[PDB]
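User: Show me an example of a complex going from sequences to C-alpha cells.

Assistant: Sure. Here are the input components:
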Amino acid sequence: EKKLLAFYQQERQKINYNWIIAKKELEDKKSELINKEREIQDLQENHFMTLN
Amino acid sequence: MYDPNTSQTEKQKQEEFLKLKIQEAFNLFVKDKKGIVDKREIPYIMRYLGQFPSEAQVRDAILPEIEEDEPSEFIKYSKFEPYMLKVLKEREYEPDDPEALLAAFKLLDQEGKGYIEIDMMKTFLEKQGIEFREQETKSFIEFATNKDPNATVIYYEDYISRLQAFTDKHIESVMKGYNNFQVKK
Amino acid sequence: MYDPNTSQTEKQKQEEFLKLKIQEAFNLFVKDKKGIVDKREIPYIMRYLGQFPSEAQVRDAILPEIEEDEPSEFIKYSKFEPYMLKVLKEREYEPDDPEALLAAFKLLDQEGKGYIEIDMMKTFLEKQGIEFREQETKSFIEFATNKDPNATVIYYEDYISRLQAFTDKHIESVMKGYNNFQVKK
Amino acid sequence: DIREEELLFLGMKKVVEDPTLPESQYKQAQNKRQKMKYIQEEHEQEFNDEI
Amino acid sequence: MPPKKAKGKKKKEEEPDDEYKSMTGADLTQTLEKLKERVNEMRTNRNYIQMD
Amino acid sequence: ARIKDEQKVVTFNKKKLITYWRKIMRIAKTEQLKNEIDIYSQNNQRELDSK
Amino acid sequence: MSNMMYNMKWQEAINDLMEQVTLEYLPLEQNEQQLGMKYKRDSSEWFHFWATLYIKYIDIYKKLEDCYDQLVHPQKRVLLKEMLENVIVRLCETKSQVVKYNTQYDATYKSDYPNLDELVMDLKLTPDCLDIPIPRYFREEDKKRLDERNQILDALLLEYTDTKEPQEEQYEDQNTLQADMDTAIRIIQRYERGRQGIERANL
Amino acid sequence: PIVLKLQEQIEKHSGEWSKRDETNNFEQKHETELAKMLIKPVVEEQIKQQV
Amino acid sequence: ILAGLVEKRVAKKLIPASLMDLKGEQNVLGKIQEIQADENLKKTEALTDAKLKKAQLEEPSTKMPDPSIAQIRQIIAEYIAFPLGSKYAKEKLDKMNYFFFMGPRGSGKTLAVRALAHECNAIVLDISPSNIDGQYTDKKQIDGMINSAFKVAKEFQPAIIYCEDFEYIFGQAKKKKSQVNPLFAKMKKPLMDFKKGKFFEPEDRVVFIGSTNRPWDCSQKEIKSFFDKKIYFPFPNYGTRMLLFKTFLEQKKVPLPDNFPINTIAHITEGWSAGSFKMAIDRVFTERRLQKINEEQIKLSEFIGPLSNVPFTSKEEFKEFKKFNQVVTGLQANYEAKKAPADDQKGDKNKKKK
C-alpha cells in the first residue's frame, strides 16, 4: 500500500509537469493561429488593393 | 452501513459520515438553489446511498417525517440529514437478503423451469404490488434479457447474480468514505 | 485437502474431518443398510475425497484391499473408512497436474491448433486404452463443448480450465467446515 | 453512468485513439510525414538535376 | 518428464520473537484502536493520488 | 480485525477531500469560465464590429 | 504548416546551441580574466555544468533530428545533417566528460551511467527529456549500398533458406511430456471418469 | 574543434539562410544563387584540370 | 563468401526493431540509492567485528543502484547507432567496436540487437555456439567462417557480429566437464589474434557483439582486456517492471481495470528477467482466453501459475551478476583504490635474496 502510494504520487507529479508543458504549447500554438488569421486577412486586404 | 456494535466514538463517526453522505448526495442533486432538492429524488438519494424503502413506506414514514409543518415544495438538508442518519443507524429500510430475491423469483416461476416468461413478469410488475410504468418494464425486460430485443424468457438466476454483483460494487462505491470523519477541535 | 506435514493437533483434526467426510459420502451412497455400500460406487466416492483412481487400479488394488476374506458385492463401512483415510493421506489417486492434462491434449493435437475434432476424441476414447461407454463419451463431448449443440471441435485449453475450476470449487465445497470442525475427545 | 461522465469530462479515463480508425490523429500525422518526406526526396532529385 | 517437486518439510514456522509478544489483552484492544482506521489514511492517500 | 481506529477506516477523508477538491476546482473552473466568457465577449465584439 | 513549424523549431534549436556555446565560453573567458590563481571547483559544480550541457544538447539533438526528418530544403538539409552529426559528436564527448567526473561521495566512479535525476527535477523536466531515440536517417542517406546488400541477402536466403520473414526468437518450452499417445489418452480418460463419477454422485 | 565547426555553421546559416526571403520562394526550394555559388568550384576545377 | 554464409545460416535477417521499443524508466531514485549505499558502507567501516565485516564485504554491494534501463538505452545508442550509423561520429569519437553484454535469458538482449539492426539496416551475423551447433566439427571451418564474417563486415559496411554463449569460448577451463562442444572454446585464439591486430579499422563502422546469460562463466580479466566496453542489464524494478506489464497487457489488447493493483503483481514478480516476463504474458493469454477477456476480467491468480512455470532467477544469481558487473567494469578496482593508505613505505627488499 505504501509503495503504491509513493509510485502514484511520483507519476502524478510527472503528468502534472507534462500537462503544464502541454498547456504552454497549446497557448503558443493558439497565438500562432491568431497570427496566421491576421496574415490571411492582410493578404486579402492587399489582394483587394492590388485588384483596385 | 451503520454498525451499532461499535464504540461511542465509532457510532459518532458513523453518524457524521451519514450526515456528510447526505450532504454530498443532496448537493449533487440540487438543481438551482443550494440547499433544496425535490422530494421525487429523495428515494433516489436513498438508493444512491443503498437504502431500499418501498414507495408506500417512503411516502408514509419518510416524507412526513422530513416535510415541514407548512408544506414545502422541496426538502432541504435540514430534515434530510438526521432522517436517514437515524434510518441507517437503525437500518429501517435495509433491503432483504439476496436469498429473498431468489425465493421471489422462484415463486414467480411456479413450474421452476429456471426462467420466467417476459409477459408473465411484466404482468406481475404492472399488476402486483407496486406497479411499474411501461418504460420501467421495458428497461427491466432489456436488462434482465441483457438488452435482448427478441428474447421471450429471462433466466432469473443470472439476473439475480448480476444484480447482486452490481449492488456489491455500488455499495463499495458508497461506503468508501463511510469511515474517517473525526471530531474537529 | 489433507496436509501430511502439519502439527500433531492439526494432524488429528484433519484425520477426524476426513473420517467425517468419508462417513458422509458413505451415507450418501447408503440405500438399504448403514455401513454397507455398493462395490461399483467405490471409485465414485474416491472422486469426492479428491481421488480419481482408474478402473484398472481400483479393480486390481482397491477392490482386493477393501474386500474381506471372501468376495462380497457390498463393502462395509468398517473396511471402507480406514482404507479411504490412508488413501487420502497418501494422495495415491489424486488427479494429475493440470499441466499434464494440457500436455496430453497438445499431444493429441498433432498440429498444435488448439482444438481437437469431436470424432477424433471419440475414436481415441473408444479405441485406445480403457474404452469409455456411450454415455461417458456423450457427457465428455457435451461438457467439453460447454453443452454446445452446434460445436464441431473442442478447445482443450478452456475445457481444461473449466474442469479444473469446477474440481476446485467441488473440493472446497466438500471441505467446507474444516475451520469450524474440532477434534472430538 | 454519472461517474463515467465525470471520468470522461472532468478527466478520469483517457480517450484512447484507435490507430485502425480512418480519422485517427496519428493517421493524419503519418500521412503528413509521408508527404513531407517524399517532398524532401523530390526537392533532392530536382535540385541535383538543376545543379 | 515431470520433475516431481521434493516433499520438503512444511513450514511449522517458529514464531519470530519480534515486538508482537509484549503485553496482555486490554492493551491489545488499545493497540487495536491504535492501528484500526488510519492505515486507510494511507490507502486513501493512494486512492486520492490515483484519482488526481 | 483492527479495522476502525488507526488502520482501515479513513476512507471518509478520502472521498471528502476528493469532494473538497471537487468544489475548489469547481469554483476555480467557474471563475475560469467567467474569464472564458469575457474573452468570448471581447472576441465577439471585435469580430462582429470587424464584420 | 510543416515548413514554418520546422523553421521555428530549428530557430529554437540554434538558440539552444548558441546558449550552450556562450555558457561554455563563459568559463574560458572567466579563467582568462582570473588565470593567476588555481580553481577550487568541486566535482559537484562541474557535474552540474556538464549535466545541464548534456540535457540541453539532448534537446537540441531531438529538435534537429526531427527537423531533418521533416526538413525539405535539400540545401538546408545538408547543413542540418552536418550540424546534427557535429552536435551528436560533442554530445558523446559531453557524456564521456560527465562519466570521468562521476566522483560523487568523495569517490572515483568512472561510470558510463552518470545520474542526472537531481538536476532533471531541479530543472523542471520529466525523465523522458533524456530520451535519445536513434535517428532514422541512417537508412535513407547512402541507402543504395545497404539496399543492394539487403537485396543480395534476400536473394541468398531464397537461394538456400527458402524463407523471407525475419526469424523470431523461438524459445523452446520445457513443458513437453516425453510420453506416448497411450499415456496421454489414459490420463485424459482418468480425468473424464473422475469428473463423471463426481457428477453422478453429486446427482 | 567540433565546437568550432558547429558554431561557425551556426553563424554561416544565420548569415545566409536566415537573411533569405522565402516569400517569393514560398515552397522553400533551392535558390539559384546558392546553386551558382556552390557550383562555381566544380566548373573552375574542371577548367583547371583541362588547362 | 556471402552465399556460403547464407547457406550456413550464420547470417540471418533479424526482425526489425526500434530503440524506443525498450520500455524503460529513468533512474529517478538511483542517486538516493547511491547515497544509502555510501552511508551503509560508511557504517560498515565503523563496525568492530572483523568476521562480520569480512562476511558483509564478501557478498556483493547490493546497495549500489544498477544502471538504469534509460541509461542503458542511452549508452547503447551512443556507442552503436552514432558510430555504426554515422561515419563522422565514428571518426570523431572513441574508436571502439567491441561490446560485451551480461544478463538473464530473454532479458532484452535480442530486443536491443533487433532495434540496432533495424535502425542501422545492418546485417547481423550470430556466431554463437548455439546458433552454429551441429554444423562445425573442426578448427579449419571455424577459422574460415570467422575470416569470412570479418571480411564481410569490413567490405559489407555497415556490418555487425553478434555472438551469444560466449562463456563456452572464454569460460573457466578448470571447471568441471561442461556438456558444450569443446570445439567452441578454440575460438579464443583466432579472436584473440584478431583483437590484438586491430582488424576492423577504427573509422570503419563495424562492431562485434558479445552478450551472455551467465557472466560468472567467462574469465574476468579476459573480458576486461578484450572488449571495448561491457554492459549489464539490470533486473526490472518496481516502476519499470509495472510499466512493462502495462505495455505488454495493452499490446495483447486486454482491457485495463481501474482498481487493479499493478504494484502488487510487480512485487509478486520480483526476481524474473524480461524474457521470463514476456514468456509468462504469452502463456497466460491464448486465442480463446483473449477472446474471452471481456467476459472475465484479468485475475491475479492468472499470473500465479505461469510465474513459477517460467525460469526463476534466485537472489544469488542477481548478487553474482552485480559482483561480475563491479569487478569486470573495474568498480571494485576503484573501491580498493580509495581505501589503501599512503603511509606504508618501500623499504628493505634486498636482504631476502637466498
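The lines above are the inputs; the final block is the predicted structure for all nine components together. The first helix of chain E runs from residue 25 to 34.
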